Design an enzyme around this catalytic site. Structure first.
Site: not given
Ligand SMILES: O=C(Nc1ccc(F)c(-c2ccn3c(N4CCOCC4)cnc3n2)c1)N1CCCC1
Lengths: 218, 202, 228, 239, 229, 214, 238, 204, 206
Positions: B1
């Site tokens: 994402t």
């Molecule tokens: O990125 C976040 N916040 C945020 C908060 C909660 C989360 F669950 C996730 C997160 C979690 C799994 N994500 C994935 N996955 C990864 C591993 O490979 C498969 C796909 C892809 N995208 C993801 N983003 C992002 N932030 C960045 C700075 C500001 C806050």
């Protein structure tokens, strides 16, 4: 205390189920005189691989449910399908409570012509088929039973179905460790289920290749 | 994402990719990652697609019930709080959901980040998801408050594009929204391979 | 006026008028009759049908409680069915917990305790039925009657309902040491046909059940051929 | 617990227990609300200056939150419980949504609590009518009345307590829409004076403006009461 | 009195508290519905206790959802509880099935709350006309204190409900224009309601079949109806 | 003892403009053996127009099926005879899967049927109810084989050739017969037969089709 | 009468008046009729007859499962409460056994549920009568439930206002119902129901529901286009 | 260790018709020292003084809970709680939490105002009372205090003598403990008077 | 630990600084999140943990304090009172199902005489509070990675008698020493002070 393998096969006008008359307690063969096949009401029998205690409790719960419903309300007794449906839901409810019925039942029944044969796992997997097995019956006996159904696609006679069960029991005796050479066969036909007096199967041990001299390491 | 939003003088841009990836296998290249909570409020889904979709749909229900009860649209502050209160209640129930609530209420444009741990941060600029680390590089370098709506969408779209090009978990269609006093408009919906040939013509 | 509104209240005379009034409901109900023989026990109950268009076996007043035991309800049928449902719950606790058919004397006392419970508390009312418990468990053939008060008593023979008095006169003519279940089905049904008001209750049948050596100590309705 | 039905319908469709809770409010001290252009004024009557009641100032117009003030009529004890409920709800609302709760939101909450008391088994109704004034965060002034039935209506001017209907019938003759902070205060006192004793000492009154709640000092007040009682002499001469 | 329990039948087979909650509605302000194929019209006498009441505040018609409006008669405070429930159920339906709740389903859910009295001391002294638009078309339902719900083509509840049924018998047909339905709704309220009819004195709402959306008529818009009559 | 067991098998759906073909292999495999070649539990009719296909654990597919059948039955009663849309059942399935996200159904569901406008649609789900409407879908052991092939032959995104006309019911059926034949050959847990259901306005027309028995 | 206030009070003559009163709720309900033949049960219910060009609808007939449904008379609120219960119980049964709850068993369940309400102080008797109509292995069943908790296995019956006229008609003909076809049963159900109508009003699709259940026929409610096959070409002649 | 986190040691000591209770002054989080002016002694009444060692949170929560119980007692009972009753009360409170305990180890010094007989009671975190004739101690320096107190302590000591050996014990034991020190507050309780003394120690 | 909070107390003010850093793993979400929440006119709390607990805690204290004023007819509670209220709230939480609030507080306040009759503490109050519920009055104190750096620097340079101006200079040295030495980028510090007059937001120091 554990039941060994159960094997069952549909024939023209019924279902045979067979099981060793042995409860093991681990490696130990504790009781070689246990009637493992149980009749459920008028039409159905059930036999379980796995915890005898979980089978004893489930089989009790089911057999009460059947007799109660029939006796309380002036209704027709539950069909095999319906008794099996109850057994399946009951077992699945137990795996959803993380208190599983830690045994694989085989379930036979005959109401009219309608001939029912089905298996249910610890986790509430259920399947109807023309032949069912649980335990090592699944790995050993099923291949042979399935071959006998593929060869006789019109359907087996009682004799052919008994000959193939007997040949599967022989192999289970040779290859399942926790087995005895004493079996009972439930036969669900129109009249209802009969359970055979316990029998043994003839066993061949005198192949020239099993002699002391050949099988010697040195 | 990859998922970014930022406040500027023209209001809020929200831009997102489209890919749901279980690390290795691409589940979908067509996930809508901007939920349209009401006519004046946008959620973004990142992390657990189920967790975000479910709890943003609940948020959307609380926002609508608010509008029925009180006969006025909910504020972004209150909407972001409702969601931050959920994620805080479930803070040690292993929710995975990084979210941005962007809207225009009585008090002008507001953008809030809301985490799975009940974090609720109000800033002028965010990017969220595996490709944030990429989006931020482009976004922070090109970001001014005084951007036109055209140039703010360009920046957003490029920032998502540059995340889709580099993040394995990010890709597909680069959708851009604009939140303004009259609500939000879906500006553009562009495939990120078409964007490569737009931005690097050779 | 306040002495008799609830079953939680004794009168000055020392009696519980609501339980006496529940008893009146049984004495105005259809006549039931039963006999305990060596062979087993027999229950016959007259069912007064309100309508010509009921099925045969509608408003069955006789219910299997267990293999070996059955309750015939003289009184309000619905109330009676709550007792049958409890008697069943007790019969199945005996098999579930203690691995035994519930004894007649036990089942009866359990039915009486239940019916009594509803005579003690302001919130509930006494049951409007006398249960006739027929059983043939390991304590032999037993006939008991729990009344609305919860008072259990064992009987050789017993009449309940609006012809209680006259049906009892006819039960006293029987010798109970001598008679078999096969005779009793005849004589108990004959008694109910005799005591019945022909002009008041035109539409009726005589539901008979037994639990005897003949029936495999299994509590069943007797076939329609024996009934007359 | 004791959940007997206390509030129940009577043959004529009346909830007697709610009609009686309203009989408790008619006996209660008169309170008055007056909505202006930029001001809400809440004026209440006090039981009257007994030499023994602590000289230290006790306010009969209760503060629910920074924005929201309420006068009540009826049972002091019951009203204290509603106000503590309202006070908690405004703070429960700031906790759950950063925003301060609007007056209309709180009024509906308080009116809901009063309704629940007319339908909860085990409880009599609250014997309390309420006048809740205040300003939403946006800047709009609100004046609401809550009766024991739990039914709430917004007003331009309102009275609760003794001779509420005399004060309301008087108010709707003389009330003008756009009013100055000074005209509202004048009007509120003039309106209270219709039913309350000629005395100036009984009236205590609060003036709400956006982010500014001020009670009139008894010095500030006796100027307005003199100016009003000379105007009530002018209206006595006319009739 | 308290001598008869809440859950007590009369000799003629009616629960007393219900039969008395219905007598509470005949005191209440008149409301009515007209189901036309073009849409469904809700109208309501406001019966403001004084001139000083902000008439918008004591709203007899309430949005349950985009497509369902309830008008109440009898105890207003009670109706707020019922309509609060309708809104929660309507939105739970949207949440769960991603679609507008049917008007019947929303009526049924409102009447689920009205059975549970022994939890609640007494019935709600409110009758609700619930009018909306779903796949079935425009529909008008009435809830009673009993928990019964009845689909109607046109119905009036409250004070002049009896006098208004008489006018519907005479005037209502099934192929009315929304415009004629509005005209009728107000024509009745004029005859029935005690006060002289003003644009502020009454509330009118319609859910139109074409867009499936609820419009609460402003006083301007109600004057437009009175102007053509 | 795990409460979970993967019973293998693949489902696939393809929507056209007037229909969905929904397909699911019939082999129910246990631990290192196979239980049945004739398991029909994989596809389950909810309404005339809406079917759910369901992979992973059979026992959970069977529970979920009944849980939905009874939510759908309640909807019929509460919404005066009206059967819920495919879209409604798809949101219901998202919602029901999520309500179990702390002991989830080990069941990779599709909901497949006609939409409001008669056009076919497939909602594929994850374990916990994340879905989107799509014009095809695949879940189960051979989903990773079939989904790229369906992408290739339907979306044609890496093809310079002009897109073929539309794809009829029989072409769409044939494409799935081919896709399953391939999966059966290469996936060890897909095989035996495929039950095809061809949902249309008119009614569901269903035909079996044999795969490699091994 | 000092004994007619509470459900828990026996009169001195051994009557429960709150039950006799709940029964009056059923007798003032709108007429429904049930007739059962060899393979079918037919419920026919009077709806309320449209006043001028103005319609009412009220759900009085309920499908409960594939194989069962209901026609209520009396407090429609209490009918809905039973409808929900029976639906819930029929679902539970079918979940467990993969087959419809047998009708004898269902008749016992309603009886029991009624009885829970006639003994506790807190509760009150259901002011509704049901005509259960169902089909199982044992064939077609028609039960009339009543507030007292009594449950009557009936060959044919009517319930509600002027239903003594319907029961009079049914008493002349009910012996021939096991010989009748489905179309003759429905004629009989309607001819019975039409005896219960006031003064001059006739049966027609707008004022009469029909529901059928039997062998290979799941419980269906006919209104409007479906009912017309039986009701367009129906007249009542002495 | 959760018990060693906040640091601090306490010791009490019986003389003739007197006792000395002495806490160090350090409050820490492991090795970082937050304050050097946090004595761990609490005065229930004239006759009872207790110290709490263990996790500082629980010293503060437990001390509050005790202050509630001892003030309620004083109102209900219309008398000061006695050492024995106070110690019994404290074991009751600690054992109320057997499964999920308070991380505190209370040291209670008391004296009967009439008899002059001294009662010491150290307790473990689940209430096990230890009621010796001589001395009790708890906290991070307890192994080193037991050594000092065993060596220096005699039976029938005057208050002034007793103070000196308790101070020398507390200081010497704290000089061998990272988690206790910055001098000590001692409290010399007699029938007649209660002396309190801040003792100069290391800054280490 | 990432976010350093610093406070010290002199004759006629408490000064509180707290790092602006809000972070997600290694990504600075912002360098300018205000960790110093005003609880009353003369009371504030530099609270440092993840945003979720820090806000849910501080808002809960702020709302209960405001509620307690509404019910106490506008009586402003002492700093000891709210410090104890806060520590009891933190301490309750470490034995709850929820778990501890992972927040470290420096609770600063100025106690003014609340009437003619007030015999209580006049002047500035500072309370160190661990997440566990450890309350300690201190002249100065710090949470965070930068805590021990600044605590030593203050041990050296803090006098009880510094001017508001000498305090700004000192708070700048403290902030600067965190930036110099902690690897976590605490590049912006919100600085507030509590005086007799109330909370004032110091912009000079950052
Ligand atoms: O990125 C976040 N916040 C945020 C908060 C909660 C989360 F669950 C996730 C997160 C979690 C799994 N994500 C994935 N996955 C990864 C591993 O490979 C498969 C796909 C892809 N995208 C993801 N983003 C992002 N932030 C960045 C700075 C500001 C806050």
């Amino acid at each position: 205390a554990s039941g060994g393998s159960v094997i069952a096969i549909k024939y023209k006008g019924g279902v045979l189920m067979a099981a060793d008359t042995l409860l093991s307690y681990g490696s130990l063969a504790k009781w070689p005189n246990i009637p493992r096949i149980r009749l459920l009401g008028s039409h159905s029998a059930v036999c379980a691989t796995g915890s005898y205690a979980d089978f004893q409790m489930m089989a009790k719960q089911v057999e009460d449910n059947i007799e109660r419903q029939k006796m309380y309300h002036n209704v027709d007794e539950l069909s095999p399908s319906e008794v099996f449906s109850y057994l399946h839901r009951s077992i699945y409810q137990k795996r959803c409570d993380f208190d599983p019925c830690l045994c694989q039942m085989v379930f036979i029944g005959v109401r009219d012509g309608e001939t029912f044969l089905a298996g249910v796992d610890d986790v509430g997997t259920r399947w109807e088929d023309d032949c069912i097995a649980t335990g090592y019956g699944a790995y050993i006996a099923l291949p042979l039973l399935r071959q006998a159904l593929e060869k006789n696609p019109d359907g087996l006679s009682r004799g052919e179905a008994m000959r193939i069960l007997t040949d599967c029991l022989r192999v289970l005796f040779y290859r399942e460790c926790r087995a005895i050479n004493k079996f009972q066969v439930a036969d669900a036909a129109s009249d209802g289920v009969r359970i055979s007096e316990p029998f043994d199967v003839e066993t061949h041990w005198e192949y020239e290749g099993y002699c002391f001299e050949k099988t010697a390491i040195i | 994402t990859t998922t970014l939003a930022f406040r500027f003088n023209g209001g809020i841009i929200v831009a997102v990719d489209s890919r749901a990836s279980t690390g290795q296998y691409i589940a979908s290249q067509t996930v809508m990652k901007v939920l349209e909570i009401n006519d004046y409020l946008l959620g973004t889904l990142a992390g657990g697609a189920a967790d975000c979709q479910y709890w943003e749909r609940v948020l959307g229900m609380e926002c609508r019930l608010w509008e029925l009860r009180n006969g006025s649209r909910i504020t972004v502050a209150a909407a972001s709080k409702i969601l931050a209160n959920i994620t805080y209640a479930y803070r040690n129930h292993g929710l995975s959901m990084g979210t941005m609530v962007a809207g225009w209420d009585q008090f002008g444009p507001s953008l809030y980040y809301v985490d799975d741990k009940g974090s609720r941060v109000k800033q002028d600029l965010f990017s969220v998801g595996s490709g944030s680390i990429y989006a931020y590089g482009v976004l922070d370098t090109g970001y001014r408050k005084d951007l036109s709506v055209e140039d703010a969408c360009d920046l957003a779209r490029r920032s998502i594009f540059h995340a889709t090009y580099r993040d394995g978990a990010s890709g597909g269609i680069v959708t851009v929204y604009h939140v303004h006093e009259k609500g939000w408009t879906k500006i553009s919906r562009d495939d990120q391979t078409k964007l490569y040939h737009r931005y690097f013509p050779s | 006026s306040g002495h008799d509104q609830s079953t939680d209240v004794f009168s000055a005379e020392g009696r519980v008028f609501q339980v006496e009034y529940a008893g009146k409901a049984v004495d105005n109900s259809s006549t039931a009759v039963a006999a305990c023989c060596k062979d087993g026990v027999v229950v016959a109950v007259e069912k007064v049908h309100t309508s010509r268009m009921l099925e045969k076996g509608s408003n069955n007043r006789i219910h299997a409680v267990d293999r070996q035991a059955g309750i015939c309800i003289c009184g309000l049928l619905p109330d009676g069915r709550a007792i049958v449902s409890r008697a069943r719950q007790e019969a199945e606790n005996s098999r579930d917990i203690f691995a035994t058919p519930i004894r007649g004397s036990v089942l009866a006392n359990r039915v009486g305790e239940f019916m009594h419970a509803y005579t003690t508390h302001f919130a509930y009312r006494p049951f409007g039925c006398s249960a006739i418990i027929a059983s043939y468990a390991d304590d032999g053939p037993q006939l008991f009657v729990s009344d609305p008060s919860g008072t259990v008593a064992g009987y050789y023979g017993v009449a309940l309902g609006k012809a209680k008095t006259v049906a009892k006169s006819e039960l006293e003519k029987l010798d109970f040491s001598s008679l078999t279940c096969d005779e009793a089905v005849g004589k108990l049904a004959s008694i109910l046909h005799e005591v019945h008001d022909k002009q008041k209750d035109k539409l009726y049948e005589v539901e008979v059940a037994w639990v005897c050596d003949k029936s495999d100590r299994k509590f069943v309705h007797v076939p329609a051929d024996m009934v007359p | 617990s004791y959940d007997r039905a206390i509030t129940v319908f009577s043959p004529d469709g009346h909830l007697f227990q709610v009609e009686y809770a309203q009989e408790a409010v008619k006996k209660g001290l008169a309170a008055v609300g007056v909505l202006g252009s930029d001001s809400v004024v809440i004026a209440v009557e006090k039981k009257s200056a007994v030499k023994l009641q602590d000289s230290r100032t006790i306010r009969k117009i209760y503060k629910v939150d920074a924005n929201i003030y309420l006068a009540f009529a009826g049972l002091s004890a019951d009203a204290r419980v509603l106000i503590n409920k309202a006070q908690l709800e405004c703070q429960r609302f700031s906790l759950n949504y950063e925003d301060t709760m609007d007056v209309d939101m709180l009024v509906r909450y308080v009116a809901g609590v009063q309704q629940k008391s007319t339908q909860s088994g085990g409880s009599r109704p609250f014997g309390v009518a309420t006048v809740i004034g205040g300003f939403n965060e946006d800047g709009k002034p609100h004046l609401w009345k809550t009766d024991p039935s739990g039914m709430c209506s917004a007003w331009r001017a309102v009275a609760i307590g003794r001779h509420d209907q005399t004060v309301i019938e008087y108010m709707e003759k003389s009330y003008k829409d756009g009013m100055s902070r000074d005209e509202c205060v004048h009007f509120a006192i003039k309106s209270l004076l219709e039913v309350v004793e000629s005395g100036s000492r009984n009236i205590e009154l609060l003036v709400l403006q956006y982010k500014e709640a001020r009670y009139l000092t008894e010095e500030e007040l006796q100027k307005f009461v003199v100016e009003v009682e000379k105007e009530r002499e002018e209206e006595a001469a006319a009739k | 009195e308290y001598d008869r329990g809440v859950n007590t039948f009369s000799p003629e087979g009616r629960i007393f508290q219900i039969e008395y909650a219905v007598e509470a509605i005949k005191l209440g302000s008149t409301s009515l519905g007209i189901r036309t194929p073009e849409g469904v019209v809700l109208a309501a006498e406001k019966r403001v206790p004084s001139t000083l009441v902000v008439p918008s505040s004591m709203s007899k018609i309430m949005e349950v959802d985009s497509h369902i409006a309830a008008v109440m008669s009898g105890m207003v405070a009670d109706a707020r509880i019922l309509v609060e429930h309708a809104r929660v159920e309507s939105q739970n339906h949207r949440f769960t099935y991603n679609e507008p709740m049917s008007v019947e389903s929303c009526t049924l859910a409102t009447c689920d709350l009205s059975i549970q009295f022994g939890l609640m001391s007494r019935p709600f002294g409110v009758s609700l006309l619930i009018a909306g638009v779903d796949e079935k078309g425009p529909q008008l339902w009435q809830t009673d204190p009993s928990g019964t719900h009845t689909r109607y083509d046109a119905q009036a509840i409250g004070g002049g409900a009896e006098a208004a049924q008489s006018v519907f018998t005479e005037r209502y047909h099934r192929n009315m224009t929304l415009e004629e339905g509005e005209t009728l709704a107000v024509d009745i309220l004029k005859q029935v309601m005690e006060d002289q009819l003003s644009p502020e004195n009454i509330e009118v709402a319609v859910v139109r079949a074409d867009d499936g959306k609820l419009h609460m008529y402003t006083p301007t818009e109600i004057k437009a109806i009175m102007s053509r009559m | 003892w795990s409460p979970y067991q993967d019973n293998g098998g693949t489902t696939a759906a393809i929507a056209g403009k007037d229909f969905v073909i929904l397909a699911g292999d019939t082999r129910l495999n246990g631990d290192f053996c196979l239980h049945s070649r004739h398991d029909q539990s994989k596809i389950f009719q909810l309404t005339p127009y809406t079917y759910m296909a369901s992979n992973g654990m059979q026992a959970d597919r069977l529970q979920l099926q009944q849980m939905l059948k009874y939510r759908v039955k309640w909807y019929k009663y509460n919404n005066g005879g009206k059967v819920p849309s495919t879209k409604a059942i798809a949101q219901l399935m998202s919602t029901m899967l999520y309500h179990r996200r702390f002991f989830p159904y080990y069941t990779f569901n599709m909901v497949v049927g006609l939409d409001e406008e008669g056009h076919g649609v497939c909602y594929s789900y994850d374990a916990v109810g994340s879905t989107e409407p799509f014009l095809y879908g695949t879940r189960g052991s051979a989903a990773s084989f079939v989904e790229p092939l369906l992408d290739c032959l339907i979306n044609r995104q890496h093809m310079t050739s002009q897109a073929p006309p539309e794809m009829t019911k029989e072409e769409t059926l044939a494409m799935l017969k081919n896709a399953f034949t391939g999966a059966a050959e290469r996936d060890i847990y897909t095989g035996d037969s495929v039950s095809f259901f061809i949902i249309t306005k008119d009614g569901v027309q269903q035909e079996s089709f044999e795969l490699r028995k091994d | 009468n000092e004994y007619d206030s509470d459900i828990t009070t026996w009169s001195p003559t051994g009557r429960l008046f709150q039950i006799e009163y709940a029964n009056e709720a059923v007798n003032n309900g709108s007429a429904t009729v049930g007739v059962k033949g060899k393979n079918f049960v037919v419920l026919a219910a009077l709806k309320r007859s449209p006043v001028a060009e103005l319609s009412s609808y009220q759900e009085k007939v309920f499908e409960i499962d594939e194989h069962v449904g209901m026609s209520i008379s009396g407090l429609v609120a209490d009918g809905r409460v039973l409808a929900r219960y029976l639906r819930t119980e029929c679902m539970n049964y079918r979940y467990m056994y993969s087959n419809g709850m047998p009708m004898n068993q269902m008749a016992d369940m309603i009886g029991e549920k009624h009885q829970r309400h006639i003994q506790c102080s807190g509760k009150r008797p259901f002011g509704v009568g049901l005509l259960l109509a169902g089909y199982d292995r044992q064939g077609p069943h028609l039960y009339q439930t009543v507030p007292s908790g009594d449950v009557y296995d009936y060959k044919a019956t009517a319930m509600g206002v002027r239903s003594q006229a319907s029961r009079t008609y049914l008493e002349r003909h009910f012996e021939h119902f096991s010989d009748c076809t489905l179309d003759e049963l429905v004629t009989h159900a309607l001819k019975a129901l039409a005896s219960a109508t006031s003064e001059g009003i006739e049966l027609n699709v707008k004022n009469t529901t029909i529901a059928i259940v039997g062998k290979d026929t799941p419980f269906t409610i006919f209104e409007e286009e479906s009912a017309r096959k039986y009701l367009d070409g129906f007249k009542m002649r002495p | 260790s959760i018990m060693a986190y906040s640091g601090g040691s306490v010791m009490a000591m019986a003389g003739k018709e007197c006792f000395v209770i002495i806490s160090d002054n350090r409050l820490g989080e492991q090795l970082k020292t937050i304050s050097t002016e946090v004595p761990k002694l609490h005065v229930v009444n004239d006759s009872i003084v207790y110290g709490l060692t263990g996790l500082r949170t629980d010293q503060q929560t437990f001390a509050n809970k005790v202050q509630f119980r001892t003030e309620m007692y004083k109102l209900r009972e219309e008398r000061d709680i006695t050492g024995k009753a106070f110690a019994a009360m404290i074991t009751s409170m600690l054992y109320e939490a057997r499964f999920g305990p308070w991380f505190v180890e209370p040291v209670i010094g008391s004296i009967d105002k009439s008899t002059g007989e001294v009662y010491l009671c150290a307790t473990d975190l689940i209430g096990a009372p230890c009621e010796p004739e001589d001395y009790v101690c708890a906290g991070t320096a307890a192994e080193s205090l037991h050594g000092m107190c065993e060596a220096l302590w005699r039976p029938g000591m005057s208050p002034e003598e007793l103070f000196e050996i308790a101070a020398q014990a507390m200081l010497s034991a704290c000089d061998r403990d990272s988690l206790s020190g910055y001098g000590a507050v001692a409290m010399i309780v007699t029938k007649d008077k209660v002396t309190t003394r801040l003792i100069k120690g290391r800054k280490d | 630990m990432a976010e350093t909070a610093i406070a010290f107390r002199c004759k006629d003010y408490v000064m509180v600084a707290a790092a602006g850093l809000n972070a997600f793993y290694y990504i600075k979400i912002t360098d300018a999140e205000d960790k110093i929440t005003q609880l009353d006119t003369h009371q504030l709390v530099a609270c440092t943990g993840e945003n979720g607990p820090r806000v849910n805690f501080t808002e809960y204290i702020k709302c209960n304090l405001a509620l307690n004023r509404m019910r106490q007819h506008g009586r402003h509670s002492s700093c000891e009172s709210t410090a104890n209220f806060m520590r009891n709230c933190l301490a309750s939480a470490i034995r709850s199902r929820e778990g501890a609030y992972q927040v470290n507080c420096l609770f600063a306040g100025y106690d003014t005489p609340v009437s003619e009759d007030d015999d209580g503490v006049v002047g500035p109050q500072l309370f160190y509070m661990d997440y566990l519920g450890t309350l300690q009055a201190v002249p100065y104190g710090c949470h965070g990675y930068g805590a021990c750096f600044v605590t030593a620097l203050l041990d050296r340079l803090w006098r009880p008698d510094l001017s508001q101006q000498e305090g700004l200079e000192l708070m700048q040295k403290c902030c600067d020493e965190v930036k110099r030495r902690v690897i976590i980028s605490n590049s912006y510090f919100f600085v507030k002070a509590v005086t007799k007059n109330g909370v004032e937001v110091i912009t000079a120091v950052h």
